[PDB]
Amino acid sequence: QCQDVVQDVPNVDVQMLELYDRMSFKDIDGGVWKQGWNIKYDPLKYNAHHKLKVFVVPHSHNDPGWIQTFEEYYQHDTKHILSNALRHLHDNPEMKFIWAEISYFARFYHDLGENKKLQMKSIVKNGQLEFVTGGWVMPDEANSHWRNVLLQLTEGQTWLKQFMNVTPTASWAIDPFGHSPTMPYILQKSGFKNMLIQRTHYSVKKELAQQRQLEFLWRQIWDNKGDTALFTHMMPFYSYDIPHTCGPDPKVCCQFDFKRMGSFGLSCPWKVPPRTISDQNVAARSDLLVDQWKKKAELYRTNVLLIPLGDDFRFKQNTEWDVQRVNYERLFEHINSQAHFNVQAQFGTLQEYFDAVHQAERAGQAEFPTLSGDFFTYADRSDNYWSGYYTSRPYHKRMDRVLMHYVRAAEMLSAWHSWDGMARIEERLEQARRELSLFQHHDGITGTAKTHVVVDYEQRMQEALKACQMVMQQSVYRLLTKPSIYSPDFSFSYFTLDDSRWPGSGVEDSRTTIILGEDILPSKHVVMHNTLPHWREQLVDFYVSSPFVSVTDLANNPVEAQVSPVWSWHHDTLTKTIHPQGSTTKYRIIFKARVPPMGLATYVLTISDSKPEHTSYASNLLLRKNPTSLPLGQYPEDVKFGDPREISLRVGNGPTLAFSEQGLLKSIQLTQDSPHVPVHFKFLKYGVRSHGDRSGAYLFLPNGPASPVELGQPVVLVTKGKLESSVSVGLPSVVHQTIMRGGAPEIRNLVDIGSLDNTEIVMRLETHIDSGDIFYTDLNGLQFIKRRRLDKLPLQANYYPIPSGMFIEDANTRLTLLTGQPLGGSSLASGELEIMQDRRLASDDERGLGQGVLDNKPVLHIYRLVLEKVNNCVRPSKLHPAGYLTSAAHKASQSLLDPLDKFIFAENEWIGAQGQFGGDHPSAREDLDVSVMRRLTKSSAKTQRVGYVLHRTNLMQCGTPEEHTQKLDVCHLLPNVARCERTTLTFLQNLEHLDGMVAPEVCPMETAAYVSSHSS
């Protein structure tokens, strides 16, 4: 049955948390291999019957945006690289090349004439040009959500299967800044057999090299059996460039980068240039090179050696192809013919390397260690930890999550039908998937690109959001209009999306007001979509032009509602205060929407001349010295004023929250009789070093622990309502808001770091939870991994990615902070959680970007804060490397990442309107998600195919009795099912033909993909 992911600690040879606990981290000079040691080998190890097989693998690292935009690099560099690769490989049958970034390859191939397309297919089919990974990009592994890692992998691999007829089974990830086990998780479930990584902490490379544990079977941290394992090769040296890939001495290896002799504007910083290989020097040069290779080979277990040959945007000039190829050919001819070397060297591909390694393994020549854990936080040298990019450009980090959800919702809503080509659904969805996929690049979501490139990514994502809205609104119109009345124009806007949290209040006034009035329009239909496969209730809000509005469902049942003012915060350069202004012309109506699994529900907002029976009005209290009036147009309740004071609020039966006089949480009381548990929010700032290394887009190099932000006497606004209450405070750089709807609070920070150069703003939580040095952070929204703060490491090393959540706990109490955006964070002392909000850095951090981070813009960060009693929960043992969310924390995370979508009907009357869609959809167990629903066929296909990715998380058992729930069989969601197949996660290979056309549900922590086929 299902593996138990909680109670069995996997036995692995290397467990990265346990390795970290024992390892030294001292940064000692190792000699020519600066972060290693002087490698020694026995010359007699290799002989006539046991040769060293060396694969030199040419490559060219092509960033889809970094210092130039995607299109700029394509025009200036990549189109020439690919064009010359085509010519040289065609003309030189033994030459090889690997290619990773399918975004560029697709951009290129579609501009090729048919003759060149045929030539390209021929060098792929014959194995000279080999795709590695085959994702749209080589994604970041820290900030990226697993759903988008899968999206981009699928976008590239679908392209490759369609046009090149190949599916890579070896992955190549040489540049992401640290590595996540989410990659082997997804890859192994997408048909992969091998992967390669590079950017791991120098101390880890040294430690694994010493034990020859650089090749390992990487399994998930909870995986006791090992079925998730994927063979992984970690490169041993500081870089993937040529000086750091031939062997341990870059002064020697640089001499074998033949692009460094002068005419290309490159040189060797170790001051010895390459020399052209000739008959007079080939024996000497070969001796030097083979010595490097044999040293590198000492670090690995087989007689097969991988020698990458490339660097950033290499293999551009024709003369470069010639100078690398001809010189290496001379070396190979000499080396291979000289028996005393006992080497056979050739150009190869990545798959060739791995195939040969496994042949050696099968021959009993090596056994490989098992490993679990991750490879964060990376440092490339000294104390230069790359934790800055966990937060850099947080506006776009938040936008990634918004677009993530919009892509899912647009693909799901439109999947229910086949669409005529004229509707352009496929075109708009392809654009949206491609722009989101592009952003997963390790200079996109990471915030490590130049300012103008960040703008290009933002513009692309904005177009993607527009494409999603277009598809979603056409889909809603079709799903909720009587079929014999449905009369689409595919260019028309039937609904517009209303999104309360993006870009967010104080970021952009983008929200439409619903305009009602007795002399213009009495009522308006709104529709909510629920992408999750269970019935869901959530409060939703709309802006309306009158406070006297009531809500009904589409059986005309009254729905309880609350009206609140529209508050906006302003930095008053007159009074030098940050304070709220109330609209006199628009108001917020809030009500609970209840929506079917993967479904839609329609409500109606109707104006009246006086207070409606089922609508209540919030009270408002402005706490500040020297108040002035706050009129609210027609709003029926007068604003109250007071001097700053502590206050307490409770919505529904939910927790009671107490706040300081500065408007920051101080305690949470779960129930009437329970204790007020200290939980204190605080804002602090980190600075930058005046001496030595400066923080920049990649590096976090604080000048000591953070200092409290001086708050002064901030203005605090308290809104108290039956359905929703909140406390908001205008702090320097942050409007901080705590919202209560009757369960775990929502936190929203409108963060505007303004002109505070060399400042990183952090939000900290201080509690009495006896967490010690332990805390938990997630990896890619997929899993929670145990972290241990280590005082042998500097502060910035104890920062980890917080892509979706983090928690601390003791025997009795847990505090979980869920996020709607990836940010960096830590627990720097027992009982603390902290998460960086934004950072503004005046200096470059010497990794090639050539700028600081001075392009900040206001961003609305969102969170849920979940305090829970956990003494009754069945948790993993002390030695287990994983943690797991509770039901409430998981639901809270879903509320941030996949909220209900809200649609406002755009014209006066919707003829043929329907009340609901999806009422008959199964309401699946709470731990199960339909992560993806995507129709895979266009309308002309006789057999329609729809793909589903199902993910089951693992939630802690804490004694809440399990309810019923319906089995979800995705293969029967659409009618006329003719076949149901389990597939790889990319949908590209059929793995199992399913009995009865029934797709089984998956085990905890497992993800599966199914494709249903339908006669049409």
Ligand SMILES: C[S@@](=O)[C@@H]1[C@@H](N)[C@@H](O)[C@@H](O)[C@H]1O
């Ligand atoms: C961290 S820089 O070395 C890295 C470059 N290799 C380039 O590929 C881009 O990704 C940049 O961030």
Ligand SMILES: [Zn+2]
């Ligand atoms: Zn790169």
